Write a protein that binds this DNA or RNA. Structure first.
Length: 683
DNA sequence: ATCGATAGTCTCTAGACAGCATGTC
DNA sequence: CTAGAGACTATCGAT
């Protein structure tokens, strides 16, 4: 007994404490691979075995005295998978978590056996020369199939390549979904694999068309005439939970309100109607509360993260009979349900276009509650036209092959700078060797000298990289890389901010010009954005012609900045939302993005001498005018309580303490205490 | 010198990661 | 390309 048997027994004893309470992972062929120390690629329809299997590999690696870094594509998953690994703490394992949003202070992190983070975060931790990042022996990359994503793809390819180039003894384990070329991923990873299509709960896929649903169980079908609003009530009655995937927030909300009529006559939460209107109210939030009360609920990126968890939790508790969602919880958090309904195979992406088979297969895969249903259902609602595509290409078709997307100017540019800053390349030559270990190369055997030299020349002009004897980063480049922003973003900032100083909207708009920023949509009615931009024109870093074929992209930037302006000029949240035609989740998202960029704009601004943006970042973070900054730094003191106090003479921690009695009248007895309680600590 | 219906037309459309350092009403 | 709901408008007609 060296370490192999020990880990296996420990893993065994542990499986017993869980197998009694998540089911069973048959075939030790996989579990054998787990304790093989060799790189492994697990491909399985459900995340079921994938994670558990993955947990053992890290516990095993933990026991040998190594550290594993479990990488995820989403913040939520990082949490879910975090609170989940909180169990292996028993055996003396220290869990961790590091997002660009949240980080565990629970333990010294660099002393954890399992550090959970997000892909881009993991990449950033490297960029920012983390210390523990260099003591990671096992790298588990969950959702490795996202390698195909035009957005997330390249980062996974780069993350892995950098990691491997470092710890040549690093063990890479990638968990993936089913897909024709999974073995190609495995080959690229130099890893034994294990492909299965096993599901804890079998899944029958159907096709509703013209009042007729036809299931598909094995070789024989089962036709039946039913309407959509019934397919739900059937499953609602069995308290099985129904998932209805819609293509637009408008669709999601519409449906949820109708289905509520049905659910209403089955349950009444009313208690949840509260936890939804808690954080925010107004149009959307109201409509959502009125759905949750009647037992229904729509779910999209417009809801606040709070309203999000509320709905998810309640759906499991059975309080919420139906959840009508968009692409959000499609691949987000684990939400089981006996039934699942795709209302459409299309989606707007340029034009109404059918989603990838993968997308559908990935939606229907949530159909089937492990340990409650003897079978899971996934119905596709289609019309005369695509019925055949639905059945032949979707219900019985195979998922598209995972294709690399790293071969793009933007992505090459974005990552090359990083590779040059972190030391992996130092000549256009090594830079290519680096891209040779990519999942793009092992998929195309193509050379990238043309673009790579192009990309590098770009960075050369922008002054992020200099060629003295070999490729080397400038202070700006190292800063832009460490800041994890698009080099174009950093160039816009550096260029503009070294030639002029900006006001509020000026610097705000500067942020909305950047590629990294999210921009609001200008509509028929935002005629006031044009006039408003005209007026502010001398305060903007540039001003296009009405005739410019880019004027509309300009108004989009402006509308976004104007929204950010109203946010830091202390405007009401719902007023903001109703004004710019956006929802609370949207506002918080937009705002949160702007702060990250605002911070970068400012660090680039300081290095170049400009100081007209200082104070803006903190303002955006809190959504207040400058005078409230001292008050909002205080815990429990936001934009509303801050104004209430400031306007009453209380304008800082001291004034808050010396007048505790006035404070309590102004902001609340409860709060007031908590607030003061906090002052005293940091004091 | 009119409100009005029916039909052709226009508008609109999912999601969500990063810095930094800890908590809105 | 592989859409479909809802707001918007025009265009003809009966009074």
């Amino acid at each position: 007994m060296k370490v192999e048997e020990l880990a296996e027994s420990i893993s065994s004893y542990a499986v017993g404490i869980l197998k009694e309470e998540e089911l069973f992972p048959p075939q030790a062929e996989a579990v054998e691979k787990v304790f093989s120390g060799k790189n492994l690629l697990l491909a399985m329809p459900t995340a079921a075995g994938k994670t558990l299997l993955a947990e053992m590999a890290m516990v095993r690696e933990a026991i040998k005295g190594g550290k594993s870094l479990y990488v995820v594509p989403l913040r939520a998953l990082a949490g879910e998978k975090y609170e989940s690994f909180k169990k292996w703490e028993k055996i003396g394992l220290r869990i961790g978590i590091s997002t660009g949003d949240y980080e565990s202070r629970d333990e010294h992190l660099g002393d954890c056996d399992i550090i959970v983070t997000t892909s881009e975060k993991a990449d950033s931790l490297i960029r920012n020369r983390a210390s523990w990042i260099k003591a990671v022996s096992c790298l588990v990359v969950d959702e490795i199939h996202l390698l195909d994503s035009e957005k997330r793809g390249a980062t996974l390819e780069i993350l892995v390549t950098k990691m491997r180039r470092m710890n040549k003894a690093l063990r890479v384990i990638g968990l993936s979904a089913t897909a024709p070329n999974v073995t190609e991923i495995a080959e690229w990873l130099d890893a034994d694999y294990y492909v299965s299509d096993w599901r804890p709960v079998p899944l029958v896929e159907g096709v509703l068309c013209e009042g007729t649903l036809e299931l598909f169980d094995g070789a024989f079908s089962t036709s039946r005439r039913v309407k959509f609003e019934e397919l739900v009530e059937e499953c609602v009655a069995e308290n099985g939970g129904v998932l209805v995937f819609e293509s637009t927030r408008r669709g999601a909300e519409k449906t949820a309100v109708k289905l509520s009529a049905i659910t209403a006559k089955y349950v009444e939460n009313e208690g949840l109607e509260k936890a939804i209107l808690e954080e925010n109210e107004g149009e959307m939030s109201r409509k959502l509360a009125e759905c949750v009360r009647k037992g229904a609920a729509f779910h999209h990126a417009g809801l606040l993260n709070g309203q999000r968890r509320v709905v998810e939790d309640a759906f499991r508790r059975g309080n919420i009979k139906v959840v009508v969602a968009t692409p959000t919880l499609a691949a987000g958090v684990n939400l089981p349900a006996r039934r699942v309904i795709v209302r459409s195979l299309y989606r707007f992406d340029g034009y109404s276009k059918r989603i990838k088979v993968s997308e559908y297969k990935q939606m229907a895969g949530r159909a089937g509650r492990p340990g409650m249903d003897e079978r899971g259902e996934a119905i596709i609602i289609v019309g005369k036209r695509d019925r055949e595509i639905a059945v032949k290409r979707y219900i019985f078709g195979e998922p598209e092959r995972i294709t690399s997307k790293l071969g793009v100017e933007t992505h090459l540019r974005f990552h090359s700078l990083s590779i040059i800053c972190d030391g992996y390349a130092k000549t256009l030559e090594e830079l290519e060797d680096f891209f040779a270990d990519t999942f793009f190369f092992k998929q195309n055997e193509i050379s990238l000298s043309y673009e790579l030299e192009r990309v590098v020349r770009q960075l050369e002009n922008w002054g992020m990289v200099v060629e003295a004897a070999h490729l080397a980063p400038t202070k700006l480049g190292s800063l832009v890389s460490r800041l994890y922003i698009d080099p174009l973003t950093g160039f816009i900032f550096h260029d503009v901010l070294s030639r002029m100083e900006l006001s509020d909207i000026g610097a705000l708009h500067l942020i909305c010009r950047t590629p990294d920023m999210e921009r609001l949509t200008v509509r028929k009615t935002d005629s006031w954005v044009e006039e408003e931009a005209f007026r502010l024109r001398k305060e903007l870093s540039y001003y296009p012609s009405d005739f410019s074929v880019e004027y509309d992209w300009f108004l989009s930037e402006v509308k976004t900045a104007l929204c950010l302006k109203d946010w830091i000029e202390e405007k009401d949240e719902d007023e903001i939302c109703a004004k710019y035609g956006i929802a609370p989740g949207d506002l918080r998202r937009i705002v949160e993005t702007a702060e990250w960029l605002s911070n970068a704009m400012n660090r680039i601004a300081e290095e170049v001498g400009n100081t007209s943006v200082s104070g803006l970042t903190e303002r955006i973070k809190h959504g207040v005018k400058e005078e409230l900054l001292e008050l909002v730094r205080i815990r429990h003191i936001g934009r509303v309580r801050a104004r209430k106090l400031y306007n009453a003479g209380i304008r800082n921690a001291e004034d808050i303490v010396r007048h505790r009695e006035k404070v309590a009248s102004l902001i609340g007895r409860g709060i007031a205490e908590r607030v003061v309680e906090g002052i005293s600590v940091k004091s």
